Amino acid sequence: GDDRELAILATAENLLEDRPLADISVDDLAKGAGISRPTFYFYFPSKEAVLLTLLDRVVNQADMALQTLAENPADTDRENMWRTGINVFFETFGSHKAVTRAGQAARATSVEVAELWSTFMQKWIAYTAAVIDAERDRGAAPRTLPAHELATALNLMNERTLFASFAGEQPSVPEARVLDTLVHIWVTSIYGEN
Amino acid sequence: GDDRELAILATAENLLEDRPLADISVDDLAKGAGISRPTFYFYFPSKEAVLLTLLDRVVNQADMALQTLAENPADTDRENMWRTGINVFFETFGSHKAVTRAGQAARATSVEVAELWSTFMQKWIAYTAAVIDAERDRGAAPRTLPAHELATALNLMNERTLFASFAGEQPSVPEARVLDTLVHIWVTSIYGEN
Ligand SMILES: Fc1ccc(-c2nnc(-c3ccccc3)[nH]2)cc1
Ligand SMILES: Fc1ccc(-c2nnc(-c3ccccc3)[nH]2)cc1
């Protein structure tokens, strides 16, 4: 039943590892899932819809992992607290590089993909700001920039910097250095008086 | 003579204000520059080449403005020093929003545009790191992250955050708040012991 849909998804993720969505065909996806072309069209209207579904899965996985941290606080210093959160996104997206690449590209051409990315970014920024606010409220973080504005910039930084690193863009921070790089910038900017 | 090339450029920049490159035609550009379609093809092989030229102009303008600061140090505190540099990019790209938008999009489809952006980013990151290094050398900045890695993340942050703001993306920092936002993050991360 659904194992056909899952097979399509798995085929798409696999094929995106070695070439872009544009060089992958509905036939390739059907062939890989062991189904005919019209059978494919029963499960998805377009290969673009397959990518959207893949991206939605990756985004919700990151989001659910963050929810679990949010409910299950690690007993440890503030630097470690931020590192563990940023790590959700490093591990989640980092474990799904092809979907991440492809989904980034699709923001330009798909309003669904753009809106999906926008929705979750608002969620993550809002949660970031709520934590900064918690920290300010307990006297651990100084009342410097508007928390929501600082949160936005830090989240956008992580988006661009993680994705450049995963892709090995020139320039990019080495993948093995990017977590520490981001954590330093978050901690200094959140706790820094100057 | 060249005023025909300049006219083409000016027409392209104008038309990009209200629609994307894809919805602008060689005819539109020729019409706007007051020349025929084949005359256009004497000055540029493609409308894509026109955009590349426009982007190259904007990028070199930012770069030359930074060179001038680099040679002409403002007498003022370290926070102001970083603010004045970041401002080169806020004013330059901010004064050319359409070219900035369009050129960002063209990185996906043009290896020339991608390589142009890559080249200048390496330059700006290298200059950032050289300044951080200067600051460390004089005992003003602590020896924390590798300077080149910190520089990369801060430059990528500015790329993504400025461009989201100029475009009014959801989410984005308000354009009237983005300079202060970026300067805070640069200063705290560069000078912060913790
Ligand atoms: F409480 C937290 C901690 C980290 C983060 C975070 N770390 N990285 C990101 C991010 C957001 C979008 C794309 C990639 C990474 N977001 C959000 C909330
Ligand atoms: F010494 C400095 C100071 C600021 C900067 C800088 N500020 N903003 C950027 C940037 C880089 C790429 C795209 C947009 C902004 N770069 C570079 C070197």
UniProtKB/Swiss-Prot annotation, chains A, B:
Please give the Pfam families that the UniProt record associates with this protein: EthR_C, TetR_N
Q: Does the keyword Cell membrane apply?
A: no
Among the GO molecular function terms of this UniProt record, one is: transcription cis-regulatory region binding
Q: Where is the HTH tetR-type domain?
A: 2-62
Q: Which PROSITE patterns match?
A: HTH_TETR_2 (PS50977)
> Which keywords does this Swiss-Prot/TrEMBL entry list?
DNA-binding, Repressor, Transcription, Transcription regulation
Extract the DNA-binding region annotation as residue ranges: 25-44
Query: Subunit structure of this entry?
Result: Homodimer.
Function field:
Involved in the repression of the monooxygenase EthA which is responsible of the formation of the active metabolite of ethionamide (ETH).
Q: What protein does this entry describe?
A: HTH-type transcriptional regulator EthR
Q: Gene encoding this polypeptide?
A: ethR
